[PDB]
């Protein structure tokens, strides 16, 4: 009886995720508009056979947050399509011509794309993951392990 009904959850409020990572200064409408502006540029770049430039442009800004679920899903769908619309033979040059933070975003989002395979194509994500881990190293996956949960 009295063994159940735990009380430790209220007397000492445990640290909650916003206490660990910096809070998002941008507003929901601002980031939503920014993503809604970035995505069609990526789609158009895919249409004109310049998928590398489209991915580079889409990689410049990356949204996050617990209140931006829908726009994050649209961003992820666009990113998955852009990456799947890239020839495989040109990957190493792209990977080598990036900064560490950009590669971190790439690996983070491809790994999140791996989490939902009932709607995506896993083969291209796995191939990209293999090549980026081969070239950049394991530090990218380390950063993935130590990234924000909302990312």
């Amino acid at each position: 009886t009295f063994r159940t009904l735990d009380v430790d959850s209220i007397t000492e409020p445990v640290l909650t995720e916003q206490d660990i990572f910096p809070i998002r200064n941008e507003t929901a409408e601002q980031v939503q508009a920014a993503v809604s502006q970035l995505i069609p540029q990526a789609r158009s770049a895919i249409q004109t056979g310049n998928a590398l430039q489209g991915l580079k442009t889409l990689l410049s800004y990356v949204p996050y947050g617990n209140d931006v679920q829908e726009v994050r899903t649209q961003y992820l769908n666009a990113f998955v399509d852009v990456l799947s619309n890239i020839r495989a033979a040109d990957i190493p040059a792209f990977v080598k011509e990036c900064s560490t933070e950009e590669i971190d975003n790439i690996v983070n989002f491809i790994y999140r794309g791996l989490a939902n395979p009932q709607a995506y194509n896993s083969s291209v994500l796995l191939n990209w993951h293999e090549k980026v881990v081969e070239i950049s190293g394991i530090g990218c996956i380390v950063r993935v392990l130590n990234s924000r949960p909302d990312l």
Partner: protein, 168 residues
């Protein structure tokens, strides 16, 4: 086996070897005690984000890490319900002897069929550069076993049918 599972297998290998940077850490809520932090989940400031690796909708690799303990549960293919029953029974036998395995859980997490749990001590004493080797080796050999055992089922059914029918 391989020549077939290159990208999925290497992704699992890399993620596992990156997620095995464990450390000795006590309990932040109980004194003079240390527990696997991935299983309790009471202090979120030391729990790395859950990570999932997949190749197809029926194959997943949930990778949950922490400061000291790592839990790694996978799903293996079950194309037809014969393989479903075979996988369930085989993996039950596999987890029934977790005492001699040191990196197994007696009961997998829900929605899966097996869950490894590498606490710090295993990395402390057992050299861990082949724990992952055993992981991938098992992930392919298990499908090998399921196919072989369904072949053996067919063979024994044929043998018993012939034995019954020949004695008219």
């Amino acid at each position: 086996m391989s020549n077939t599972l290159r990208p999925y297998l290497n992704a699992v290998r890399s993620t596992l070897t990156a997620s095995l940077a464990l450390e000795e850490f006590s309990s932040e809520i109980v004194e003079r005690q240390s527990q696997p932090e991935v299983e309790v989940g009471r202090s979120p400031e030391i729990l790395l984000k859950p990570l999932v690796v997949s190749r197809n909708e029926q194959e997943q690799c949930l990778i949950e890490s922490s400061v000291n303990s790592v839990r790694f549960s996978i799903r293996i293919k079950q194309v037809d319900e014969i393989e479903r029953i075979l996988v369930r029974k085989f993996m039950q036998f596999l987890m029934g002897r977790a005492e001699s395995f040191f990196i197994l859980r007696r009961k997998p997490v829900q929605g899966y069929d097996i869950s490894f749990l590498i606490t710090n001590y295993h990395t402390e004493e057992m050299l861990k550069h082949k724990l992952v080797d055993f992981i991938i080796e098992f992930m392919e050999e298990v499908d090998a076993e399921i196919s072989e055992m369904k072949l053996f089922l067919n063979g024994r059914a044929r043998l018993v049918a012939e034995t019954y029918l020949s004695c008219f």
